[PDB]
């Protein structure tokens, strides 16, 4: 994340890490069996890591999980990156305790104005690269569909929202797709696209996760 | 890290698609994509992806670096 | 600099590197004899660093000459930072060429809106801490004093000057210090400090050369 | 680099003065400077400091680096 | 250019004219704002001409954009024609389309060999004036400074190179300099001077443009 | 006397040949010259010349004088 | 076009500087340089300027032009 | 004459002002209708005045005898400046007598070291300006071609010869060109050229007109 | 490990590496808390890796453990290299398993001609440089201490014993130190010094182990 | 890595102690030692220094690298 | 004079290295070398180094002083 | 000097003192550029002091003069201490009189008995630190190579003698090395090295300067 702080060892027991050798894309724990992630981070043979706050040294209760099962929406566009997400079911069941936990999915879209809680092991730089050992956390209100709209003209769509500031500064980065975007307690959005990081009326692009419950629901029990 | 060459400081001010061609070139593990600036870029990272970002002329703006 | 963009090698061949066995602070060349940097940074015993781009690589252009005698103004305030400017000969002269060249002192005082260019190798980052190979550098205008003292109340001397942006995202930062501040042509401005780096409302603060054109001019005739 | 230990994350949440202390008795070439992230700051490079930055309550409000 | 071919319209559309009543210097586009040309070519009240192929008819699509900054390489002989290198300012930016194009600064210095275009609306005749309305192109290789110093005898910088025949016949003459010479699809060379028009081993002298990559990029971003 | 302005002790600092544009925009009777000061100078006097002097970096060291 | 008299082809055998003479005699809006055969020339063209190019002798050898 | 005595009143009266409105030129009398001049002070329509000491005044017994005829040596090289010498032809004869007389033609060339004297109404100073209302004059030794290609590295032909002092401070200035520098009751050089004025290691630049008797005295039989 | 081969995945569960930034020496487990190394790895604030493979890529099964006491034997010698043993003391105990485990103490000296295994992360040439991501192994017989001090003319103590091959081409490297040289499942020799790697006639010097079982087993009780 | 530069090759055939001092100048994070390689030399690895290899002459016969 | 802590006579009586550390820990100016009592020592003058003398026991049996 | 006397203003006019901020070693001058000193007194950037006795009080007469070029013996071996000798060119060469002179370099070897004069400003105490403000002088007999090596066994090379007493409280001490050691007017020895200062059967290890006059000569000569 750039602009973002240093969040705390654990203090996001429900961001976990996909692994492909490295570090490669975030995600969202919604049970013992399941995690919720961008289409776009589709690989093969993922490694769910749960639990950790240092991706480059072995903390003691980490929890390295295979993916035996990933599931894009069907209607996922890889071009408007419209229904961009994605459910990941895990070989084994995870050990859920403080460290490791789920989070609630939403019943209710929040409104412009509700300050979130965005999470991820991205690049922390708008212009070059510096990627950290430490998770990175950010506080960053939603944004109108007219300002979204006018940073995007044409490019937003139903299922998308821009969160972060169009003074620039601060922003989800490369490398954190898939992460979290939480708001009151339940997860809200999903790290998307944008335009560059954190850049001047480009403010953020994450998916809208009140849009996909009914599927999420659906498709948990279906497989 | 990432296999082969990182980043191509010296090829700013190239056209897009020599870049892309010499990206190639130089490091046999990563897809050279030539992109607008003001176009949209996913935020996932991939050691067998090379950005080449250009703006309205199709000349290399920002250092291409393998993310 | 925070948010700027790879100057490229010698793209800035005045700019020079203050050392003591790591590059602490920058500075201007102004005759092959002197450099102008904050006052700030008063060490004793530098060596000055001419035509360097990477400074952890020795590329072959490089000079490094050591600080014969260094003079900080009579009227430098260590607390409100007012008057925050050094002159340093050069132990012996330097060769000036293609990558190593002097500016210009400044006629009148650059006006409001000024498009500068600042240059430097300090930090790169908003919050946390990532230090570049090379040279970086980042455009930005001069800002009004309404502005620049409502940005910094009661902080704001007739010899300083804001630059940057009160959005934030781009600014100079630590280890910036003494680096030049050029409009259109010449040295007016002498990066010295701030609130942080890049912070919204908080624009960078540097020294305003025009007003010590005749001490710079008369320092050199009597030192 | 500079000698010694580099940062104290752990000690975000602590008290300014008490965080100076332990950084000075951790790293013997640093000279600790607790401060007010609403004042000014100089833009130079010190191997020989460590500024704790504190808010209005004097807490240590981000972490302590040698800078 | 004497004894070279007709372009054809705006088949050169970096190709500018340097006017003040009457055309009296070519200029090569680099960016939507800045013209590089000869420095010998300097003078007060510049209006650039851009997009055009018959400067006495007004064709449309033609702009006519005033010189607002004008810079001579601070290293300029006037004696010796070294470094005859100067960059022009729009007053504003130009608009760039099919016709109205700029073009890539080099990388490196060609070889002894290397066909270059030379393009003009100077003088096409060996002896005698007769100016064209239509700009004039003409193919030339580089020659080797063995050939360019037998040719012209301690007057040929490292700044310099020769380009044309050793035969005569064709050359570039009054009226093209500031020209752009073209190899590989990027600027090395400006039209400098020569003894006489298309003569017998005494073919076209130029500014060597790669060794002004660094003071060109310098010189756009501090002023 | 000669027409116009005589003395710009003002271009002392400026680049030759920009102070040779300012020279000759403020007094129209002069055909000012850049030259540097290593070179050899004819020794007539002329109220239609200002030599403007430089040194190898191309700033004026001499004040341009009408001579 | 240039004004006043474009060629003196009537100067042709004479010495440099008595033609260069006439030359800004007749037309008050240029400046005649006496130039060598042997010497280089910029490729620049000005209304302002005939060039008066000799030889050896001293000798117009070639017709003053306004170019 | 920079560093000079006061003549007094006609003591030189073969010194001729060249007048046009203001001095411009000095030269020297050889007889009743010819003058002795450097090349370089060619103009169209010169006033040729005899007879002078102030020449802001008018006293009495003076010659104001506009010239007929201006004939420049055909060798004369405008840039290297060999052979700046030239003839002029008044319109009438003047009157010889005690404060107008003409100077004698060299028969062979002085030796170095020998004291010659050098008048004129040039520039006063070696910095600044100030010119003299009575003629100037000052005796200085013919220097060695060996110190005079030191003090200039391939810049003296065979048709020229420093003088004056390698210490500096005395020299011939800018107003004294065409002035003669008479050795042993005979007429040796011609004021030419220099570096400045009365500068350390750069001394006057003459004419050696003892190569061109034989062309004055052609030009005079022919002309 | 020069001229080795590959261990593979903790096929050595005893082998520990000391860590600092970077791993500058090895080590060998002999219980929960205490690790034998060589003396002249000593550093302040050490942190032992247990159940590593790849040093550079986070695997999931190893214990990072910083070192709480360091003890270097009284009677090491860093000149002569006599007496090159220390033992670590780990803060917390380790989780002994199938792949950290520890090495029993040796009771007897083995003889000359044993086949010993020699495992580590050090360089891999004789000359150049090539540092592996993966454990080094290599099979090792005991040396003479006739060839021992035939190799080393009075440098051998009896408190060392050389290992490898008199041919030389396969040998113990930088970054091997503190490694473990194991006999017949019994830990009888610690990587120390040589002259070089793998050269010819100059073979592996290893401290003595079983003269300082009496020394481990007081220290560990002391301690 | 290790900081700094890492390999002198061209400090190969010059004396020992200037090279080792060439190489301090250069890299200011290490030690440059020089022995005779006829010694013994321990098996760890440094950051912070650099052997500078001799023979019987004195002269360089070892590329000094950071180990 | 030398900069910091000079002296350290409450470290007679321990061990080589446990003090070299600590002396290490308190002056980051100096390089403490454990030295034998009976081995040479250079006659020169260093503030960058601390002799840890010890005897055949391994034990400081003399005040570490900055030499 | 442990047990010596105060030697009186500039008594030993060839003694110089090493300084790098401190003074670190001592030197003997041996003309006009050119200091014998002590090669393991070796540093970079080392400044010349001659003519001094209060090196803590600037009395004038003194000469601070940088050092150029320093120069080892390429046999110098670090370990044991052989060819411990370096020389010292000097930046400018020394202005040479009463109290700055030169001393003569051996024709012949001393024999034991030779009373010898060690100067220098060293330690003067045998336990504990006192360092003089005055340079301290000392007379000391040159011993046999019997005596030597009975108190050095299998130290002492033959460019090595002792020099002192057998009974101790007297000798050169810590701050002393490169000192001279003059034996009948001619410099016969170096301070170089020894066991404590002023110990019981352990003197002055010195370097033995007749083996070296032909490298002495030749490196002056070739540099
Ligand atoms: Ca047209
Ligand atoms: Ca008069
Ligand atoms: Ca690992
Ligand atoms: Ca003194």
Chains 1, 3, 5, 8, 9, 12 share one sequence.
């Not at chain 1, 690989?43 to 295979?66: A, C, P």
């Not at chain 1, 409104?111 to 050992?133: E, F, H, M, R, V």
Request: charged content about 15%; hydrophobic content about 30%.
């Amino acid at each position: 994340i750039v602009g973002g702080y240093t969040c705390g060892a654990n203090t996001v027991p429900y961001q976990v890490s996909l692994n492909s050798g490295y570090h490669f894309c975030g995600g969202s724990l919604i049970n013992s069996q399941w995690v919720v992630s961008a289409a776009h981070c589709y690989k093969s043979g993922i490694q769910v890591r749960l639990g950790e706050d240092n991706i480059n040294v072995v903390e003691g209760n980490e929890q390295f999980i295979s993916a035996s099962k990933s599931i894009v929406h069907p209607s996922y566009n890889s071009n408007t990156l419209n229904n961009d997400i994605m459910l990941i079911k895990l070989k084994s069941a995870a050990s859920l305790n403080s460290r490791v936990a789920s989070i609630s999915l939403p019943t209710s879209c929040a409104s412009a104005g509700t300050q979130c809680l965005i999470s991820g092991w991205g690049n922390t730089k708008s212009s070059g690269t510096s990627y950290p050992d430490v998770l990175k956390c950010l506080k960053a209100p939603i944004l109108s569909d007219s300002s979204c709209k006018s940073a995007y003209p044409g490019q937003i769509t139903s299922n998308m929202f821009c969160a972060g500031y169009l003074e620039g500064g601060k922003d989800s980065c490369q490398g954190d797709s898939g992460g979290p975007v939480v708001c009151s307690g339940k997860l809200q959005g999903i790290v998307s696209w944008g335009s560059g990081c954190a850049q001047k009326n480009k403010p953020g692009v994450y998916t809208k996760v009140c849009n996909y419950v009914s599927w999420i629901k659906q498709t948990i029990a279906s497989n | 890290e990432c296999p082969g060459k990182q980043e191509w400081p010296e090829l700013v001010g190239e056209y897009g698609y020599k870049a892309a061609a010499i990206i190639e070139r130089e490091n046999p593990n990563v897809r050279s994509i030539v992109k607008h600036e003001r176009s949209g870029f996913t935020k996932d990272f991939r050691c067998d992806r090379v950005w080449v970002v250009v703006d309205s002329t199709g000349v290399v703006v920002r250092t291409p670096r393998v993310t």
